[PDB]
Each structure stands twice: as structure tokens, then as C-alpha cells.
Design an enzyme around this catalytic site. Structure first.
Site, PDB file in Angstrom:
ATOM      1  N   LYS A 118      81.576  61.913  12.660  1.00 17.59           N
ATOM      2  CA  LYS A 118      81.700  62.041  11.194  1.00 17.59           C
ATOM      3  C   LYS A 118      81.599  63.503  10.733  1.00 17.59           C
ATOM      4  O   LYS A 118      81.930  63.826   9.587  1.00 17.59           O
ATOM      5  CB  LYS A 118      80.603  61.188  10.532  1.00 17.59           C
ATOM      6  CG  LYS A 118      80.631  61.010   9.014  1.00 17.59           C
ATOM      7  CD  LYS A 118      79.472  60.068   8.644  1.00 17.59           C
ATOM      8  CE  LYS A 118      79.183  59.986   7.151  1.00 17.59           C
ATOM      9  NZ  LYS A 118      77.906  59.246   6.901  1.00 17.59           N
ATOM     10  N   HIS A 168      80.219  43.399   7.002  1.00 17.75           N
ATOM     11  CA  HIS A 168      81.027  44.397   7.689  1.00 17.75           C
ATOM     12  C   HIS A 168      81.760  43.815   8.892  1.00 17.75           C
ATOM     13  O   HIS A 168      81.265  43.791  10.025  1.00 17.75           O
ATOM     14  CB  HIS A 168      80.139  45.574   8.099  1.00 17.75           C
ATOM     15  CG  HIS A 168      79.400  46.186   6.950  1.00 17.75           C
ATOM     16  ND1 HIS A 168      79.257  45.544   5.736  1.00 17.75           N
ATOM     17  CD2 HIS A 168      78.747  47.366   6.829  1.00 17.75           C
ATOM     18  CE1 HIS A 168      78.548  46.303   4.917  1.00 17.75           C
ATOM     19  NE2 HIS A 168      78.227  47.415   5.556  1.00 17.75           N
ATOM     20  N   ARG A 225      94.318  54.088  16.503  1.00 17.31           N
ATOM     21  CA  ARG A 225      95.011  52.954  17.170  1.00 17.31           C
ATOM     22  C   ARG A 225      95.785  52.146  16.112  1.00 17.31           C
ATOM     23  O   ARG A 225      95.677  52.398  14.885  1.00 17.31           O
ATOM     24  CB  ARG A 225      94.075  51.988  17.994  1.00 17.31           C
ATOM     25  CG  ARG A 225      92.608  51.704  17.550  1.00 17.31           C
ATOM     26  CD  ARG A 225      92.400  50.807  16.309  1.00 17.31           C
ATOM     27  NE  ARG A 225      91.144  50.045  16.408  1.00 17.31           N
ATOM     28  CZ  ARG A 225      90.546  49.400  15.406  1.00 17.31           C
ATOM     29  NH1 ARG A 225      91.075  49.423  14.190  1.00 17.31           N
ATOM     30  NH2 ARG A 225      89.433  48.698  15.623  1.00 17.31           N
TER      31      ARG A 225
END
Lengths: 497, 111, 111, 497
Positions: A118, A168, A225
Site C-alpha cells: 500500500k 468483505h 489479474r
């Protein structure tokens, strides 16, 4: 410009069968790789040639890059397609993959591990013209599909609204995204493609954003991806994303300019899990007894990697199928996807198909009441408490069971009237006494009809004449079990011993 | 030679009510370990029965009488069979048990 | 399965003669099974060696019929009939009478 | 404007089925005529009404225009389609044919025998404005499709590259043509239509050209018929040539103006002959034991005129079928057309299927290495010398063969274990001794497998697990013969007697 004869699919399940489908359509040989516990699997069938990796767990098999790369290399493949998950995002593989002579169907090593921390990411995204978060009310998880080639070109194939999710974990994605206006589209559209050139991207990928009520979007992260829910994005345009990957891979450049990628109609998708609706998403994993995908039709699509009767593994993602529906409007897709979901039946394990059924038919989903909290919000209306519902049911269930065991026909005299399990009796009514068991509540059903009717059964269907008003509910047996679709739910009933 | 057996107008004479053949329930090779190595070491014969019959289904006659001799019906590759396997010694009870059983199969023409 | 030892055995094929166990497999139906009878026949019984007592016998499908087959091993002591060779040939015809199986005698013996 | 009720197809094989197919699609009755040796024929089945001509020879039959013309007239048709070959090019027919009241689907008399002598032609072309050859380096036989109507209009439907030819006889035609650029297209294009207005053309037809390295093309001759390889051209356009024929003949005008004749994608075609790859193309003629056409798919098309079990006549052209595949690219068509050639299998006769597979897979073909000498050039790479290859084989075909005869099951006791031909033995391993014979060499295979594995066989596919790497090669049986595709080739194995 390089050419591929055999593309090795370094993955399993629905996604390897989904990539297999395209390679085949393109005239390319499909080599699949399998763990030990998948020598029986579907993707090993649909593969021209297949190779045995490790044993059971995802670790010592599907994630072993040393063997996958030696496999495809000894298999005669000149390219590997990672699929999503597993070894899709990790330069280490792509690196030792491309350094083996093989063309890695994905971004370069560089760009992969870039989005790996991140820190490195918020770095180039800050210095890219990609809005980050300052430091959000009813925020909507909106992503962007983008595609680049080995020739600098790079356009966004519009976006998707993947908000409705279980603690999530995406479950209902759609394309385009309900709210957002024409400009807000082109807005985040380029915004993503910015961060795209940022890392110098090759393959396809999605740039995760999180837009909120006030009207502002913020970069969350990015996947190097093909995204799991790409079908709905292919729905709204008319592009076979996978096919494109094998194109950029060879050299070929993108066929459409930015102001060319289309957007006719609306597509909605669902993830079919071996989870558990109310049992608090406990990814159970038994064995597929019953599995009936609705028949193709209108604008019906279904990407699956399993076939009834197959063994549902514990060591892998419990996702059986992806059910994608399309329409010319948003309501035409949902109403038609709802159709698919009621025509679909899986039996012999815990499924979220019941959950999905009422989340697409939940009035909240009708209107654009989308955010990342809707899953928890109307938590009650989507995960109700059970109950041994009526005898209303039991009745059916028994008549049904009875009508699914021919009795027995002796070759002695086939024509024997003693095979008719109608429960015939001298002068009183037909008496059939049956020791059933549904869920975990056994009951000795008394079946005493003097009026032959009530319920008849043709094929995998229970037809009932409920007072002039005939209704037909699906019902079929497999072994000691008989599956009857009773009000959304698909209950399993069997013989007590 | 083959050709002679060709025109033998041959037809089988036996006749049982065999059913569809279903395999055992436990790998037949598991027997190796079922048999104790110490010749004089007591073990349960049903365990060998379980590995030969179809679906390892075995209906036991005089279940708990002269247990020294186990007797029962089952099928083997379709064909129905009446079994008699020793399980130890053999006092009077066991023999009567076994003679009565032979009667039953001899009456139904089961091997 | 060596017969009278590579020695004579080869001196056999020399005569242009198919070996016993070969004639058999040639005769059976493509891929049929074959249940041999007393292979260890006359093992360490006679002074010398007399493999399977100079005669191989068993049951196998020939033209769709379960048949009893017996042929002698000319290689084994000239195919001659040692006492047990006789007991074998005979025990074979019992299995044949008792179970109604046609017979194929693959004759190749001394006396 | 005149109307056709029944079109008679004075021809046989895949071409009659080809035109019948269209006839049908148009709601038009199709009347084929047959020779003596073809009352069993395919096109006689696909015909709604059919007449008996002469005997066997092509002369004594399909060539007898006096009977074909009478048959057609007594058959109730109002038009005749001569197809390619036979009587498709000779005034005498069209003349007395049109002199019979029927409409001849082709050029009028005049135009036919026009290109009948090189002299008469050289004359029209010379005084037409179509370059001739003065009096060539790596020459590339390229042709042009033309279409005109009874109304002056006359468009060219782009070109074709039919260079790969066996001692002159087209083998692999395609469209567009490799090299030639935008201008050189419309170049030779109008140059054909020029030679078109020259003879005052009616139907369809091709203008065979011969361009060379230096970049110039020259008229070689012209065919006043639908060309052999019209598929590829319909491919890249999207038009049904023969349908257009049935139109022009009525009166109907051409639907497209020159600057409308489409051209997306690329297409490739091959001719499937009962010839012989290495045996130096000696047109064998036996009987079709096995004939499995690749399944319909991506952009796969096959024009065939035979069906497994058919008698391959000696008196006729040994062409079984035409296999065409298209793509959005050139290799997408080649890679896909090689897909079809592998899924395709014909056994019980000498085939050129063997040769075709390797010439589409030769690297020379990848690159535009085209001329009329290519077939001769890479001579060895395309017709290698045979060899009684591995034992590696012999065992597979032996296992294969064993698993192709159930043994036999007696009604006495069906479930009998004596039907299992697994070669079971008392204590050693499964022993199966097989007296086989492939090509011209008999082998007594010794099958002693201890580990029951090696090769399974389900459907018409031999699946082998060679060290973790499972691969399945096609193999099937018919009669005392077992066809096993071993390395491109399709060897036939049968029992010794």
C-alpha cells in the site's frame, strides 16, 4: 510478435474451464495442471493434456511454481495463464515464468509487486493523478476494467458496482454501475487508466475505487489479474476479455479506441457458494448430489467448474458457479437473473442459493440503495430464522417420495398389477405409510387419499391441483435422498432406518 | 478348435436369481491386514466376509447362538450365496446352527 | 511357468511347436480370464522337478462358453504321465462333469 | 423476371449438396440427377426428386446433356445448375439447355466457349485492358471473384491465393490473399471486371491471375463457373454465392454496389482427397470405413458430400470434402483450421488428410512464403518417409484393441465375470496375448500389465496417464479394423487369421 500453440492454465475450477473455452475457440491447445485430489476434476477433462502437480492442500500443489513452470514447459505450452488468486499476483512467478521462455499472461514482474504494498502503491497513485483518501458515507465499491498491450495503448472497458458483500467478499456485481452519470463515468475511467500507465501495465486488470454519497471516488488498490467478476463487463460490451489476454500476449494491439468500447444494456452477476445462508457463512464442503443449472436462453450465461456428482473439496475456494444475466434495462436483467436462480438447484450440501434468491428480489435491490453496508443492513430480510414449516409440505414430500420408487417389476410377469404403488386396498382408501425424514426431523407420514389426485409427478416436477389453481414445483430424487424445492429453499428428504 | 466350440448349440443350465453386481465396501486388499500373523490369534471373520460380498451387506442367521460359527446370506458379483465361516471352536450349538442353515439354503437352491 | 527349464523348453519351440501355456492363451477368447488348477502340482514331490505335474489345466472362455482345458507340457519329462499328472488330468474332468463344462484336450505327451 | 420452382442440379457429390442446401434455404425444390453407381449417393438423398442417368463412367452419365436436359424438363424444374466440372463450361450445353426453355445458371453460350481457346481469349483480354504476359519470379496464383447480372452491373468480390498446388491442382486456397496491399487489390479487382464486361458476363466466375515478386499480375485464364473454392470468399464477405446465382438467373439485380462488397476477417480452405500423401498422389478408391468430421464451432465450416460407410468410386474425382475455417486474423483461421483437421479422421483408404495437417503446421506457411513452387520446395518436410515407429505404439493399439470387444455376454447369466476381458490370472498379472496386424506387419503383442493402469478407453478416445501427464488420443473401431490416430497419421489395426 510471438505465437501460442498450447496455453497451460495454471489453475483449477470454473476459471480454468472459462480460459479453456476461449483458448479452444481460438484454435489453441489447452493444457491444464491438477493437484492430486483433482485427477477427477472437470478442468482436467476439458484439457487437451493435463499434468499432475502436488498432493492435496493448495500449498504443495497449485502454488508450486517450480513444477507448474516445468510442467507447462515439458507439456509443450508456450504460455501460462495464472487465472485469479493462486499465483496470479507475485512477480516471483511471472519473473521465473517469463525467464523460462514462457509468456506470462499478465502484467510484467515490475507492475505486479508494485501494487504489492500500500506504500509503493499510494506513492505512484499520489504522483499519478489518481485521487487517494484524505487524512466516507454509504460508499459504493466501484471498480474499473482496463486493458493495455505491448504497444503503450490502454483503454477502460467501463466499470462495475461490486458493493453488496459478505463481511468483505463480493457477491453481487453489476455493469454498468446504477448511480453514476455519463461524466462521472469518463471521470474515474481515465483516472484508472492514469494509474495504469503509472505502473506501465501490459495485461488486463481492475482498479478498485470507493465512491461515496458526496460524489467523490478514491483509489483503494489494484488487481494485476483478470477480475473474478469479468463476465458482466463482457456482457455490456461484447468482448471476450480472456481472448484479448492471449492477443496482447502474442504482440497484437488493442482493436478498439477509447471512444469505441460500447455499452449497450445491463448485466448482473452472482457467486454460487458452498457456504451457508443463515449458518453464518460456514463454507461447508461435502459432495454434490443434485446440480441442475437453469437452461441457457434469453440473455442467460453461466460459468461453472463443477458437475453434479462431483466431490466438493475442503482445500479450495467453495465457489461452484457464477450466474450472469443480461437485459436491455436493469430490471430486465435482474428479473431474468432471478429466473435463472429459481431454475437452478443444488442438493446435498449447504448453499447460498437460497440467500441469493431473496437478495435479488429484496425491494432494496430494486432501487439503487447500494453501499458496502446493505449486506449487514437488511440482514434480517435476507437471512431469516428457519422452522419446520407446515404438513402442507410434509404431504407433498411424501406423495413425492412415494412416486419416485417404481416398486419393482418382476421379469416373471412385468405386467403384474402388484407394482402399482398406489397403496391400493379392498374398499377403504389407498393407504401408503411411509417413514420419511427431512432436515433432522423424522415423521411417519399417513397417506390416505380416497380422491386419487392431489399431486402427480412428471419428470423432475411436482404438479399440484390446489383447488382449480394448478402450480408446478420442481422435485427430483438421487439415491436415498429426494430433493424438493419448497418455498425458495431446496430441502432434502430420505428414508429412516 | 475354436470353431468346434462354435457350433455346440450350447446353453447354460444352472439358474439363480442373481441381481446387479455391486462391489464390496472396503478394498479387497485390506484382507492382508485382517488376518493376524500369529496363527493362534483370535480375530473376527465377518471382517473377511465384509470384503467379499456385494456392498458388504450380510444377513445373519441365528445371529447370537453358537457364535463359534457365523452363518448368513448375501450376494457375490450378482449370484446369491449362503455363507458359513468359522469363528473359533465349535460346540454342539454351532453345528445345529449350521445344519439348520444348510437346510434353508438347500431348500432355496442357493450356493 | 518355466516348464522343463529354458533348456528343453527352447528345444521345444525349435520343433516349431507352440509351448503349452501359449497354445492356451492363443485358444482363449481375446482377453478372457483363466482360472488355473493346481499349479503347485507335484511340487517337491518327485525326485526331480516336474513343473505343474507336466500338465496345465484350467477354465477359460472359448467362443463364449466357460470351458475346461488341459494340455500337457511336452517339455516336462517328455510330457509323460507321472502319478500326479494322472490325478490332475482326472481332477480336471471332475470339475468338468460336476459343473457341465465342455472339454478341450490339447494333447502332446509321451506315454 | 422469371421464377424457379425447382432447380435441377446436374452434378454429384459435395457440390450438389452445396447447391441443394441453398436451393432449400430459398424455398426452392432441388432435383439432383444420378448415375447408375450413385442411386445410393448422398445428393440423391438430399434431393426432393431425382432421376437415373446413364451407367457408371462420367461419360455414359453425368455428361449426357441430352438426358440431363430431358430429365430436368420432365422433372418439373425451370432451371439447371451445372456445378463445377462436368458440363459447366461448354456452349453446346447452355445453348441447347437454354434452347429447352430452362434457365442455365451460368454465362450465356457466347461467353463460355469464349474463354474456350487461349487465342480467342488473349484477344478479348488484350483489347480489354487487362495485362497479359509479354513474349516469372516466385509466381503467386491469385484469382478474382466476379458477379454480374442481366443488368450490366458487375462487382468483384475481392481475391484469393491458391498457390500451394500439387503438380498443378489447387490444395490450399485462402482469402484475402497474404501480401497484396489495398491498391493492388482494387487493382487486379477492376482488371477482372474489365475482362468481365469484355465477354458480356452473366453469372459468377473467377479470373485466374499470376502475380510475381516484382509486383505485377497477368491474366492466365478464366472459369465461366462458380469456382471450386468459393467458400473462403463467402467467408470473408458474408454472401451466399449460389444464392446470388439463383437470383441473377431470375432477373433480380445485384444487391451491392462495388464499394459495398465487404471483407472482414480471413478464411482458409483445404481439399480432402482420397489421394495419398507419400505414395505420390495416386488417387486411391476403396470404401469409407471411418469418417468423422470435426464438430461445428468457432467459425468452422465443412462442405462434404460423403458420409461414413459410403463407397468411394473410381470413376469420379476423389474429393471427400472441403474444410474451411475463418478468423479475425490470419493465424486465428490457420490455428483453428488445424484444429478441425485434427478432430477430423477418415479410415479405410489412402488419405491426404495426413499431408494437409503438416502443411498447415509447417513454419513456411506461417510466413507469407507463397509461390506455386512451395508444394515442391519443402518437399521432404511435407511427405517424410514412413517407419514401423515404436513399440510405444504397438502396446497402445493392443490395449486399445483389447478394450474394443466386450468379450461376450451370455443371456444365461449376464452379470457373469467371464465377460471381463481384463486378462485375469490366478496370482501373476493380467495376461492377454493378441495376434494383431497394423499396416503390413503382424505382431503377437504380449500384454502383461501388473498395475491395471496404462490406458483407459472411453467413447472413441484412448486416454493415457504417462507419468502424471495424462493425454488423450482419438481411437475407435469399425469391423475387424481399429483406427488409431498415432502421430498425425491414422493407422489401421486388424486381427491375424
Amino acid at each position: 510478435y510471438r505465437s501460442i500453440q498450447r496455453l497451460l492454465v495454471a489453475n483449477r475450477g470454473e476459471i480454468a474451464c472459462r480460459v479453456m473455452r476461449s483458448a479452444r475457440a481460438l484454435g489453441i491447445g489447452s493444457v491444464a495442471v491438477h493437484s492430486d485430489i483433482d485427477r477427477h476434476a472437470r478442468h482436467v477433462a476439458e484439457a487437451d493434456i493435463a499434468v499432475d502437480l502436488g498432493g492435496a492442500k493448495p500449498a504443495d500443489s497449485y502454488l508450486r511454481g517450480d513444477r507448474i513452470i516445468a510442467a507447462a514447459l515439458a507439456s509443450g505450452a508456450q504460455a501460462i495463464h495464472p487465472g485469479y488468486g493462486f499465483l496470479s499476483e507475485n512477480a516471483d512467478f511471472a519473473r521465473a515464468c517469463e525467464e523460462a521462455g514462457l509468456l506470462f499472461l499478465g502484467p510484467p514482474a515490475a507492475a505486479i509487486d508494485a501494487m504489492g504494498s500500500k506504500s509503493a502503491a499510494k506513492a505512484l497513485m499520489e504522483e499519478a493523478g489518481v485521487p487517494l483518501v484524505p487524512g466516507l458515507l454509504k460508499p459504493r465499491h466501484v471498480e474499473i476494467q482496463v486493458f493495455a498491450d505491448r504497444h503503450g495503448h490502454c483503454l477502460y472497458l467501463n466499470e462495475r458496482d461490486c458493493s453488496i458483500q459478505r463481511r468483505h467478499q463480493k457477491v453481487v456485481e453489476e455493469a454498468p454501475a446504477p448511480g453514476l452519470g455519463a461524466e462521472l463515468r469518463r471521470a474515474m475511467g481515465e483516472a484508472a487508466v492514469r494509474a495504469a500507465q503509472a505502473i506501465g501495465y501490459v495485461g488486463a486488470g481492475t482498479v478498485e475505487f470507493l465512491l461515496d454519497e458526496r460524489g467523490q471516488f478514491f483509489f483503494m488498490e489494484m488487481n494485476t489479474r483478470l477480475q473474478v467478476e469479468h463476465p458482466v463487463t463482457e456482457a455490456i460490451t461484447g468482448l471476450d476479455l480472456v481472448a484479448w489476454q492471449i492477443r496482447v500476449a502474442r504482440g497484437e494491439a488493442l482493436p478498439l479506441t477509447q471512444e469505441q468500447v460500447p455499452l449497450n444494456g445491463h448485466a448482473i452477476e452472482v457467486r454460487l457458494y458452498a457456504e451457508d445462508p443463515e449458518g453464518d457463512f460456514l463454507p461447508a464442503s461435502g459432495r454434490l448430489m443434485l446440480y441442475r443449472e437453469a437452461a441457457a436462453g434469453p440473455g442467460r450465461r453461466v460459468d461453472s467448474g463443477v458437475r453434479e456428482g462431483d466431490e466438493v473439496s475442503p482445500f479450495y475456494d467453495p465457489m461452484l458457479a457464477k450466474l450472469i444475466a443480461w437485459g436491455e434495462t436493469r430490471e430486465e436483467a435482474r428479473q431474468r437473473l432471478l429466473a435463472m436462480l429459481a431454475e437452478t438447484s443444488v442438493g446435498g450440501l449447504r448453499t447460498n442459493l437460497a440467500f441469493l434468491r431473496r437478495i435479488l428480489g429484496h425491494p432494496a435491490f430494486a432501487a439503487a440503495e447500494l453501499d458496502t453496508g446493505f449486506i449487514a443492513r437488511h440482514q434480517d430480510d435476507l437471512l431469516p430464522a428457519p422452522q419446520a414449516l407446515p404438513e402442507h409440505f410434509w404431504q407433498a414430500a411424501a406423495e413425492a417420495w412415494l412416486q419416485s420408487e417404481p416398486g419393482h417389476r418382476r421379469d416373471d410377469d412385468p405386467h403384474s398389477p402388484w407394482s402399482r404403488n398406489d397403496g391400493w386396498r379392498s374398499a377403504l382408501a389407498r393407504e401408503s405409510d411411509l417413514m420419511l425424514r427431512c432436515r433432522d426431523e423424522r415423521r411417519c407420514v399417513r397417506l390416505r387419499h380416497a380422491s386419487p389426485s392431489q399431486y402427480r409427478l412428471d419428470g423432475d416436477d411436482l404438479v399440484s391441483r390446489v383447488d382449480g389453481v394448478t402450480r408446478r414445483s420442481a422435485a427430483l430424487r438421487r439415491g436415498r435422498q429426494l430433493f424438493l424445492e419448497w418455498e425458495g429453499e431446496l430441502l432434502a428428504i430420505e428414508a429412516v432406518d | 478348435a475354436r470353431r468346434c466350440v462354435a457350433n455346440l448349440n450350447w446353453r447354460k443350465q444352472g439358474q439363480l436369481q442373481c441381481r446387479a453386481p455391486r462391489a464390496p465396501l472396503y478394498p479387497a486388499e485390506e484382507l492382508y491386514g485382517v488376518i493376524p500373523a500369529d496363527s493362534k490369534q483370535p480375530y473376527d471373520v465377518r471382517e473377511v466376509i465384509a470384503r467379499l460380498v456385494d456392498g458388504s451387506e450380510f444377513d445373519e442367521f441365528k445371529a447370537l447362538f453358537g457364535t463359534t460359527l457365523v452363518c448368513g446370506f448375501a450376494h457375490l458379483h450378482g449370484y446369491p450365496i449362503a455363507i458359513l465361516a468359522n469363528n473359533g471352536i465349535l460346540f454342539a450349538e454351532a453345528a445345529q446352527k449350521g445344519a439348520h442353515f444348510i437346510e434353508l439354503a438347500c431348500q432355496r437352491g442357493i450356493p | 511357468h518355466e516348464g522343463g527349464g529354458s533348456a528343453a523348453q527352447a528345444r521345444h519351440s525349435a520343433r516349431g511347436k507352440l509351448l503349452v501355456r501359449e497354445r492356451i492363451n492363443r485358444l482363449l477368447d481375446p482377453g478372457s480370464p483363466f482360472l488355473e488348477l493346481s499349479a503347485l502340482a507335484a511340487h517337491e514331490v518327485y525326485g526331480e522337478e516336474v513343473a505343474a505335474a507336466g500338465i496345465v489345466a484350467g477354465i477359460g472362455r472359448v467362443e463364449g462358453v466357460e470351458c475346461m482345458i488341459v494340455g500337457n507340457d511336452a517339455t516336462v519329462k517328455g510330457g509323460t504321465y507321472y502319478p500326479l499328472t494322472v490325478k490332475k488330468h482326472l481332477r480336471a474332468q471332475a470339475i468338468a462333469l460336476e459343473n457341465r463344462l465342455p472339454c478341450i484336450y490339447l494333447v502332446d505327451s509321451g506315454g
